[PDB]
UniProtKB/Swiss-Prot annotation, chain A:
Protein species of origin: Severe acute respiratory syndrome coronavirus 2 (2019-nCoV)
Protein name: Spike protein S2
Function: Precursor of the fusion protein processed in the biosynthesis of the S protein and the formation of virus particle. Mediates fusion of the virion and cellular membranes by functioning as a class I viral fusion protein. Contains two viral fusion peptides that are unmasked after cleavage. The S2/S2' cleavage occurs during virus entry at the cell membrane by host TMPRSS2 or during endocytosis by host CSTL.
Highest taxon above the source species: Viruses
Gene from which this protein is expressed: S
Lineage: Viruses, Riboviria, Orthornavirae, Pisuviricota, Pisoniviricetes
Length: 49, 90, 152, 49
């Protein structure tokens, strides 16, 4: 099966680059929404608001 | 599972714990500073003061909040209890 | 067989290019809205035209793209102050029109949100509403009242 | 990020006394190359069959 895959190795190269593209595009999605600030602000112990 | 046929699942870069840490940092920033931390250094401010500025942004004078602050606080707590109850009932 | 292989390659290329076209269209719509708001005027949307209080943007030509040189307004130095939401002068509660009451330890002033410009507590920048026993936190002070010394 | 705590009180405020004019760079791609692909020259060479 692998010998005959060399005729379609370019198709898998597009596919692996596509799935890697989605995976890295998915990791960046969480960074653009939750990582708005670069400092963790601690909740004050006083809860009298 | 769905991994026996080579369909491997790549774990996320950010786990649920630091995502919760991201939210809690944002929650603490928006209750102790308002919007100053989102556009520069964080500036300390009282929450009743901050509630008045949000009222000033919608065309309402800030004098009405301090007249009935207990009413708005009770309405906020009841609304928080309502959404928590509605989310408990997908 | 060569025909069907070449058609498969062209179909997957056309699909990929059309997906890139959709992404480029989304980016182009975002860039057009950013130009029309941040460049052709001042946008009130916070953290849309850069980190800070937006003033304006300077668009520049780019090969197959566009860049924006936003002008933001971020504070640099801040000072801690003791504040009060209202002033009890003569049983009437005074509230600031656009500023906030601040104190340096001895006296009280009213200053704007994004800058420290201390001013004397006067009638022109404050308005009264109701009685004094309505706010949980209130402090006692006096109002300069710019009509009293001039009528003499 | 940097773990810091914000001192919170019911009668404490922070009024800035100075400002710095900062300029932020943002990159938006709006264009790409426009290519045209035809079957007759790509799929076929110089053969009528
Ligand atoms: C708080 O602010 C008040 C009002 O500006 C200051 O009082 C003045 O201080 C200057 C500085 O020497 C004197 O020249 C004035 O005569 C003062 N006026 C009055 C009415 O006292 C006060 O010094 C400030 N306190 C601090 C700690 O900064
Ligand atoms: C602020 O001013 C009010 C009124 O001028 C003060 O209320 C008075 O308090 C004294 C004793 O604390 C009572 O004998 C009076 O009857 C009160 N008058 C009124 C109209 O309530 C209040 O104590 C002052 N606050 C501070 C911190 O000095
Ligand atoms: C606000 O910040 C600016 C930027 O640092 C200050 O300007 C500097 O002031 C010092 C001393 O006056 C000079 O030696 C620098 O050359 C200035 N830098 C620039 C870029 O102008 C300014 O003094 C600060 N203002 C206040 C009131 O503190
Ligand atoms: C003001 O003082 C408080 C405590 O008195 C401190 O926590 C805060 O950091 C101070 N603010 C500044 C800007 O130094
Ligand atoms: C601020 O909170 C403290 C602690 O609960 C309290 O002792 C103080 O009276 C409060 N001050 C005002 C103005 O509400």
């Amino acid at each position: 099966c692998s010998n005959l895959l060399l005729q379609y190795g370019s198709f898998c190269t597009q596919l692996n680059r596509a799935l890697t593209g989605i995976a890295v595009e998915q990791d960046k999605n969480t960074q653009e929404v939750f990582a708005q600030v670069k400092q963790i602000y601690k909740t004050p112990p006083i809860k009298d608001f | 599972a769905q991994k026996f046929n080579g369909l491997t699942v790549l774990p996320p870069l950010l786990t649920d714990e630091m995502i919760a840490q991201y939210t809690s940092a944002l929650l603490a920033g928006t209750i102790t500073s308002g919007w100053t931390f989102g556009a520069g250094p964080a500036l300390q401010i009282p929450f009743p003061m901050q509630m008045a500025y949000r009222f000033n942004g919608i065309g309402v004078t800030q004098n009405v909040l301090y007249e009935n602050q207990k009413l708005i606080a009770n309405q906020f707590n009841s609304a928080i209890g309502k959404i928590q109850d509605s989310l408990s009932s997908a | 067989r060569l025909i069907t292989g070449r058609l498969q390659s062209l179909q997957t290329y056309v699909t990929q290019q059309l997906i890139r076209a959709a992404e480029i269209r989304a980016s182009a719509n975002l860039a057009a809205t950013k130009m029309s708001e941040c460049v052709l005027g001042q946008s009130k949307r916070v953290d849309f035209c850069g980190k800070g209080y937006h003033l304006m943007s300077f668009p520049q030509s780019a090969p197959h793209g566009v860049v924006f040189l936003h002008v933001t307004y971020v504070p640099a130095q801040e000072k801690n102050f003791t504040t009060a939401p209202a002033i009890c002068h003569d049983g009437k509660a005074h509230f600031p029109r656009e500023g906030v009451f601040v104190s340096n330890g001895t006296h009280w002033f009213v200053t704007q949100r994004n800058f420290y410009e201390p001013q004397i507590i006067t009638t022109d920048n404050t308005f009264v509403s109701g009685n004094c026993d309505v706010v949980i936190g209130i402090v006692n002070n006096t109002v300069y009242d710019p009509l009293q010394p001039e009528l003499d | 990020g940097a773990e810091n705590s914000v001192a919170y009180s019911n009668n404490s405020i922070a009024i800035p006394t100075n400002f710095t004019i900062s300029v932020t760079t943002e990159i938006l791609p709006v264009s790409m190359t426009k290519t045209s692909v035809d079957c007759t020259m790509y799929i076929c060479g110089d053969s009528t069959e």
